Ligand SMILES: O=P(O)(O)OC[C@H]1O[C@H](OP(=O)(O)OP(=O)(O)O)[C@H](O)[C@@H]1O
Ligand SMILES: O=P(O)(O)OC[C@H]1O[C@H](OP(=O)(O)OP(=O)(O)O)[C@H](O)[C@@H]1O
């Protein structure tokens with residue numbers, strides 16, 4: 200019979216948990232049954248033990264059990280997510296969010312998991328809010344947005360209200376723990392593909408292992424400059440998840456003709472500033488921010504392509520880049536954002 | 546400027562803290578300024594990082610700053626403690642408490658730190674209470690007990706009221722942490738000598754290092770059967786603290802003619818049962834319990850002898866054993882307990 204002392208004792212002994220134990224712990228947390236001290240002890244102990252993919256998968260599994268689901272038959276089998284852990288401490292423009300709009304405009308269904316900033320100036324949700332997008336729609340309306348606009352946004356606190364018990368605790372601790380891996384792993388629409396950012400180089404393989412268990416087609420990405428995105432300032436490490444397997448790759452955008460950017464060229468500001476950057480990119484402005492958006496959009500398109508076993512790496516990237524660039528250039532991305540705004544108002 | 550994220554982040558990165566950081570943390574805890582989540586995160590993180598003697602010495606130092614002290618010049622320079630961490634999971638008779646009575650009766654001033662049980666059926670304080678000894682005395686009366694009876698008992702919760710802020714958290718976590726090293730290190734009378742039990746074999750050297758920093762004459766002891774006492778069932782490991790230095794020894798009681806015992810023979814019960822066991826030993830009953838009490842009393846006498854650098858190991862033990870046995874056989878130990886009970890009733 201599981202108990203906090205049994206589980207915390209096992210972790211502080213530097214032992215992997217028995218099957219089901221992480222799930223038991225997470226379920227106690229989600230039902231409001233755990234003391235703040237137990238939540239904090241579990242978060243820290245799991246982090247220092249070094250969590251396994253089995254363990255992180257149990258945590259994410261419990262969250263998804265407690266999440267509001269989308270209605271039956273409303274998420275396309277090939278829907279994709281574009282989201283990261285955050286926590287890279289660099290404060291960039293909102294690359295995942297911009298990429299998502301471009302990806303949707305290219306015709307790939309996007310159901311994005313998102314949230315406000317935890318430490319950056321403006322997170323994906325904050326910037327969407329500044330752009331006039333309704334970020335907090337419930338399951339039925341997200342499904343509708345996806346069908347009618349081509350993109351839906353699942354606001355994490357809206358879909359995971361039981362995770363709130365762990366909220367103050369994680370803020371009070373104030374440093375990242377295993378719980379900081381869970382955002383991209385708990386999209387309530389359960390898309391099977393994704394471009395997934397991870398700020399923590401040494402845990403990205405663990406996140407990839409969780410997606411592999413679900414047989415998702417995902418690229419887990421970590422910029423070698425620290426970004427939880429595909430970067431343009433240097434190479435990125437990619438953990439490619441395909442056919443239940445993980446393959447570690449290094450990716451160099453110079454191989455596709457991208458100029459090296461400086462990190463300050465990608466710097467973000469407050470929500471108004473970041474919204475203006477979105478408008479600039481969608482309006483066709485050339486430069487470092489556009490390049491980074493096109494690259495990340497292409498990455499999500501490659502993840503989507505990977506849902507088929509016949510897809511090949513280089514042609515997939517060349518196609519992703521072509522489609523992402525064209526979605527912007529034709530004005531399809533700009534128009535999709537306007538239509539998304541109108542949807543929320545109507 | 547120190548903060549919880551700074552300290553917890555350092556610990557979760559498996560780094561030793563900078564000088565003073567552990568003290569800052571402990572002081573935040575003891576002043577009621579730490580959230581339960583922060584207390585728990587710190588306890589767990591310090592435990593898994595592996596605490597250093599510097600760090601543990603800082604925690605104990607902060608406790609001692611906030612403790613009620615005994616009145617000036619009321620504690621002899623050669624006062625001795627006999628106390629352990631507890632947590633050995635064996636539930637023995639109260640060896641330290643019995644040893645302490647015998648040591649005082651031999652004429653060595655004892656100011657003992659004690660507490661009720663945390664995981665056993667009856668702790669030292671519980672058993673003293675059952676015997677009629679007052680465990681509720683404040684500083685002035687403990688000083689008076691020491692002068693008039695030859696022994697004083699500092700009940701830990703009476704002398705460390707500010708430690709209450711961590712009490713609930715430690716119970717909620719329900720497993721040992723670095724905080725479980727602190728009991729024997731925080732006797733408010735600050736004796737310079739002691740026989741100190743440590744249940745946690747891999748941390749006994751750390752406790753010994755804290756005592757070395759203070760230049761105490763201490764034997765930190767761990768029975769190789771797991772006891773936080775000198776055992777009679779097998780060898781014990783001793784970390785001998787003398788002249789600011791620590792030496793690790795293997796100790797075998799057979800060299801002084803002790804019969805090997807079995808742990809079941811040292812087993813305890815509730816407070817009334819354990820009190821009965823004290824009365825039996827003090828009344829001259831021969832057998833395994835007496836042997837273990839005599840062995841531990843002698844160890845405390847050896848630590849006391851060590852306060853002079855001219856003391857020698859094997860003769861110290863022989864003298865300690867002689868004095869401990871005589872203290873029981875003459876009835877001195879029994880009479881002291883009677884006198885101690887009487888003192889409390891006034
Ligand atoms: O404040 P931080 O912890 O650094 O997090 C930065 C943002 O990154 C994550 O989202 P996402 O990848 O969707 O946002 P993006 O569009 O900014 O990349 C997270 O939900 C935040 O919105
Ligand atoms: O419940 P546990 O965590 O196992 O602890 C048992 C006892 O050991 C410690 O005291 P001490 O060494 O003074 O007690 P003793 O006389 O029983 O040895 C502790 O303060 C408890 O009183």
Ligand SMILES: Cc1ccc(C(=O)O)c(Nc2c(C)cccc2C(=O)O)c1
Pocket residue numbers: 282283284285312313314317355356357359362378379380381382383385
């Ligand atoms: C989409 C996303 C991204 C990161 C995080 C993170 O805290 O690391 C995140 N966390 C939350 C989730 C998964 C659900 C509900 C609330 C939150 C939150 O921390 O606010 C949600």
Ligand SMILES: Cc1ccc(C(=O)O)c(Nc2c(C)cccc2C(=O)O)c1
Pocket residue numbers: 628629630631658659660701702705708724725726727728729731
């Ligand atoms: C004497 C002694 C022994 C062990 C412990 C321990 O918690 O492991 C201990 N703990 C306490 C101290 C040092 C002061 C005040 C209260 C306690 C307690 O845990 O109840 C006190």
Ligand SMILES: [Mg+2]
Pocket residue numbers: 282283285294295296396427428
């Ligand atoms: Mg992102």
Ligand SMILES: [Mg+2]
Pocket residue numbers: 283285287291294295396426427428
């Ligand atoms: Mg990012």
Ligand SMILES: [Mg+2]
Pocket residue numbers: 628629631639640641642742773774
């Ligand atoms: Mg003891």
Ligand SMILES: [Mg+2]
Pocket residue numbers: 629631633637640641742772773774
């Ligand atoms: Mg003991």
